[PDB]
Amino acid sequence: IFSVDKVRADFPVLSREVNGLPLAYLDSAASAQKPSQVIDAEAEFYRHGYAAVARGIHTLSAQATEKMENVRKRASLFINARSAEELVFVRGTTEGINLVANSWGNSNVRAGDNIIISQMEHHANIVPWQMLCARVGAELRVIPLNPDGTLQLETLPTLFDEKTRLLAITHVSNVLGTENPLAEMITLAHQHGAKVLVDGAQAVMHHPVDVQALDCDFYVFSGHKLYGPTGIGILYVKEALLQEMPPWEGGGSMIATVSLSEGTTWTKAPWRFEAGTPNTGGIIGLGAALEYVSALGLNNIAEYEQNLMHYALSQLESVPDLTLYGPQNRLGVIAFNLGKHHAYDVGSFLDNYGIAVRTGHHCAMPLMAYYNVPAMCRASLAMYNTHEEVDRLVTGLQRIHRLLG
Amino acid sequence: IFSVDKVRADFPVLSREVNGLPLAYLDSAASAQKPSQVIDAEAEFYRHGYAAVARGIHTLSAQATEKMENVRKRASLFINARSAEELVFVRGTTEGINLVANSWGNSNVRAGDNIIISQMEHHANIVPWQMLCARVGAELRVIPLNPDGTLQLETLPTLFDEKTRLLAITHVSNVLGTENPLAEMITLAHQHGAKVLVDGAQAVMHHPVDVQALDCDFYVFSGHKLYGPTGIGILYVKEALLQEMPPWEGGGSMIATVSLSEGTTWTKAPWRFEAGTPNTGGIIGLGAALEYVSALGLNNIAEYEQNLMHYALSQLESVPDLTLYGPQNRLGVIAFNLGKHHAYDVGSFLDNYGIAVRTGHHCAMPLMAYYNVPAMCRASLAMYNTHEEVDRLVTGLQRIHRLLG
Ligand SMILES: *Cc1c(COP(=O)(O)O)cnc(C)c1O
Ligand SMILES: *Cc1c(COP(=O)(O)O)cnc(C)c1O
Numbered sequence: 001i002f003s004v005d006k007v008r009a010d011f012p013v014l015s016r017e018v019n020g021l022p023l024a025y026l027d028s029a030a031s032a033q034k035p036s037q038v039i040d041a042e043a044e045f046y047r048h049g050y051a052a053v054a055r056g057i058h059t060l061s062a063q064a065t066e067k068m069e070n071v072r073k074r075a076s077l078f079i080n081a082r083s084a085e086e087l088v089f090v091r092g093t094t095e096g097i098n099l100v101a102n103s104w105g106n107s108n109v110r111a112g113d114n115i116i117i118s119q120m121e122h123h124a125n126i127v128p129w130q131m132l133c134a135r136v137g138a139e140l141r142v143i144p145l146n147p148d149g150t151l152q153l154e155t156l157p158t159l160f161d162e163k164t165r166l167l168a169i170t171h172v173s174n175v176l177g178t179e180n181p182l183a184e185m186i187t188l189a190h191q192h193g194a195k196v197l198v199d200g201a202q203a204v205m206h207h208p209v210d211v212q213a214l215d216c217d218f219y220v221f222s223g224h225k226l227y228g229p230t231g232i233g234i235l236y237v238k239e240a241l242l243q244e245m246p247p248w249e250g251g252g253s254m255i256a257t258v259s260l261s262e263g264t265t266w267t268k269a270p271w272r273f274e275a276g277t278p279n280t281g282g283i284i285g286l287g288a289a290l291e292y293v294s295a296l297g298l299n300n301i302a303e304y305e306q307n308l309m310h311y312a313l314s315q316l317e318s319v320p321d322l323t324l325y326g327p328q329n330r331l332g333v334i335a336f337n338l339g340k341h342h343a344y345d346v347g348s349f350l351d352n353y354g355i356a357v358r359t360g361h362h363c364a365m366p367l368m369a370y371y372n373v374p375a376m377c378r379a380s381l382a383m384y385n386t387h388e389e390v391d392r393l394v395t396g397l398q399r400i401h402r403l404l405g
Numbered sequence: 406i407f408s409v410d411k412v413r414a415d416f417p418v419l420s421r422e423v424n425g426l427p428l429a430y431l432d433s434a435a436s437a438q439k440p441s442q443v444i445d446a447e448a449e450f451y452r453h454g455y456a457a458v459a460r461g462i463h464t465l466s467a468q469a470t471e472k473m474e475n476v477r478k479r480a481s482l483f484i485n486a487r488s489a490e491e492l493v494f495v496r497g498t499t500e501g502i503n504l505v506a507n508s509w510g511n512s513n514v515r516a517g518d519n520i521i522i523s524q525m526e527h528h529a530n531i532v533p534w535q536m537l538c539a540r541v542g543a544e545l546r547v548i549p550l551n552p553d554g555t556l557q558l559e560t561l562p563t564l565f566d567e568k569t570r571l572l573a574i575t576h577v578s579n580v581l582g583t584e585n586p587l588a589e590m591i592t593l594a595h596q597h598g599a600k601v602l603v604d605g606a607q608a609v610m611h612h613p614v615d616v617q618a619l620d621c622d623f624y625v626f627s628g629h630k631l632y633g634p635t636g637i638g639i640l641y642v643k644e645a646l647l648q649e650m651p652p653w654e655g656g657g658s659m660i661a662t663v664s665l666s667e668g669t670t671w672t673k674a675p676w677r678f679e680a681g682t683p684n685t686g687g688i689i690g691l692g693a694a695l696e697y698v699s700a701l702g703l704n705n706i707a708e709y710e711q712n713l714m715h716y717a718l719s720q721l722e723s724v725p726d727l728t729l730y731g732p733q734n735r736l737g738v739i740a741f742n743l744g745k746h747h748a749y750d751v752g753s754f755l756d757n758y759g760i761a762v763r764t765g766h767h768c769a770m771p772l773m774a775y776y777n778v779p780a781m782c783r784a785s786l787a788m789y790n791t792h793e794e795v796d797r798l799v800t801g802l803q804r805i806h807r808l809l810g
Contacts, residue, residue: 031682042448043445054765056435098655119434123656127656130668178704249500251533275532279635280751281634281635358466
């Protein structure tokens with residue numbers, strides 16, 4: 001079983017005070033706090049083992065290379081990829097989507113084709129496709145939303161045709177907490193010869209993810225939302241696709257030979273997609289984050305978080321004039337607005353109580369426009385949050401309502 | 406004055422042992438060791454202040470935003486840029502060059518134009534220009550080398566013409582230690598209306614750098630060579646150029662508005678070029694590295710390193726059959742080969758003595774081809790290295806020569 005008190009003991013930020021008051025950090029969906037096991041793994045690498053990792057002959061450099069490739073293997077087992085060589089280290093979900101959009105998109109999407117996204121996508125999984133569509137003359141089609149925050153799946157027959165080259169779809173909404181029916185949508189997309197990129201940035205910390213079972217063609221997530229350091233993420237690509245993809249960034253370590261008279265040739269995937277000095281510190285930290293999460297157990301995490309979410313939704317019924325957005329079975333986040341008060345003001349009062357929530361458009365302006373609001377508040381309920389933190393949120397919303405009503 | 410013993414006390418890796426023997430780390434040009442002040446600045450941020458930095462309303466997020474923008478200001482003062490808004494955070498020199506090559510190169514270099522590089526460039530400052538030239542149909546011209554490792558500057562009249570759009574040139578060679586006459590070359594390039602990108606990855610840790618005095622249009626360097634963390638670097642761009650450049654990566658934080666029916670508009674530079682969650686941990690660490698280097702004083706560093714280099718060159722005269730590459734006035738690095746022995750074998754013996762040097766092509770294959778060797782050894786003499794470490798290198802080379810001769 002899961003013990004939230006033991007977990008919290010690993011996270012030094014959680015004893016912080018804000019505005020003279022104890023912090024209630026309800027913004028893990030924007031970025032997660034990190035356990036000391038992750039912080040110290042990176043620090044200890046810098047203190048005792050640091051070197052460049054170009055398979056350098058000298059000992060420290062050879063050992064750093066091995067650490068980095070071990071993390072690639074660990075990450076591939078974490079998402080059940082068939083091969084470690086199907087994983088590319090990127091800065092994060094955003095860079096991974098841009099890499100696919102340029103390397104795969106530029107040589108596979110042509111004038112007159114179409115790409116399908118959803119109306120709930122994060123900007124990271126919108127803008128690169130708008131740029132691609134503008135570069136090659138393709139059309140960006142959109143799966144619309146239902147009022148309860150689920151996809152209008154009945155529209156799929158009008159959107160998929162012979163010219164559909166790619167579905168790019170979120171696994172879990174960063175605003176609504178909706179989990180999309182990926183396995184079934186990927187079956188439909190593949191029936192038309194379309195590939196599927198999955199934005200998994202809000203899925204990988206809440207329950208096991210298995211890319212062979214999903215059969216997705218691309219999968220991306222960020223380390224800093226998975227209790228890990230900033231500056232590092234993972235792009236998974238099916239081996240047969242990745243081996244045909246041309247490089248994106250050029251430079252050292254992704255070449256086989258460089259000549260100023262005969263041109264340059266590329267190395268093999270995945271190293272062809274990793275130019276320049278890798279983020280070795282971030283990679284070490286990410287490896288430690290995966291080990292920490294696996295030691296807790298993602299099914300234990302999912303069970304505790306689901307219980308916390310059920311409790312929060314039950315308690316929030318006692319907040320007058322609270323509007324919630326999204327389905328009852330949400331994962332991770334609670335998007336809401338309080339009466340007619342602007343999210344920014346609600347979030348400012350909550351911050352004044354020491355409660356950190358996010359307000360604004362959450363990098364999902366098309367989703368805000370669907371609900372005809374300029375902004376929302378969002379509380380994240382992660383594995384280190386508590387019933388008492390939920391109680392503080394509910395009470396704070398009640399007091400804000402009383403005061404501003 | 407400079408005290409190398411006090412400096413070394415800040416670097417925990419330097420007490421490491423390798424192969425049972427005390428480490429002599431002579432590979433800082435590949436990546437530098439980090440002082441505990443840098444390691445702990447990042448660790449303490451993760452432990453006490455961590456949050457997402459989207460100018461988030463809540464306190465931790467607002468304070469993280471301020472820390473990040475303070476580092477941008479500190480970096481701009483470090484290189485004497487006129488404005489903090491002329492600096493873009495990138496993963497490193499390599500990504501910064503790719504960003505310029507795509508954003509600026511794609512809309513300013515046309516079929517029939519030419520770009521000028523040098524034969525001593527690192528692959529980071531070659532491959533992106535080869536890719537650009539292939540995309541738009543331009544020609545990549547090359548300033549050749551002299552035998553002493555300096556540029557053949559007399560060839561410049563044959564290379565610069567009305568169609569020359571860009572000179573991309575290294576400040577300091579990562580192999581030879583040659584420092585190029587940037588100010589004069591930039592004057593010549595500007596006379597023709599060409600812009601100049603400077604690869605400063607091997608300059609910024611050896612002496613003050615002043616981009617207003619240089620008048621370069623772009624300048625790039627990496628944090629991990631400047632005693633800082635991996636995963637972070639700086640791209641400087643003149644304000645008037647940067648404000649006209651289109652975005653490269655798309656996603657959150659670089660947009661002003663996102664619409665699925667009316668399209669998307671971009672925010673202002675530099676934030677237009679920073680998509681997704683920044684590498685906040687790396688940014689904090691980089692700020693601490695700049696403060697550490699400034700506290701030591703770069704003129705103090707330069708004086709000590711120049712004295713160390715003069716001593717090493719004097720002592721290496723007693724190594725039989727040693728071939729050195731590059732000019733007598735080199736900065737930072739000593740490139741060499743020992744008789745007819747392959748660099749890989751020499752480097753393996755040195756590693757076996759606990760001495761870390763780099764061997765191979767050093768991401769400069771055109772430079773190796775110029776000297777008609779497949780590989781070289783390279784020793785870096787940084788601010789924390791000692792006369793006694795130089796003595797170990799000289800003795801090791803003498804023993805290798807005796808043993809293998
Ligand atoms: C280090 C090096 C590079 C590459 O820097 P990265 O941090 O790997 O991106 C580019 N140019 C020179 C001169 C270098 O020494
Ligand atoms: C976090 C988020 C992103 C962006 O991730 P970055 O780390 O900022 O690149 C993309 N998609 C979703 C669903 C997210 O929650």
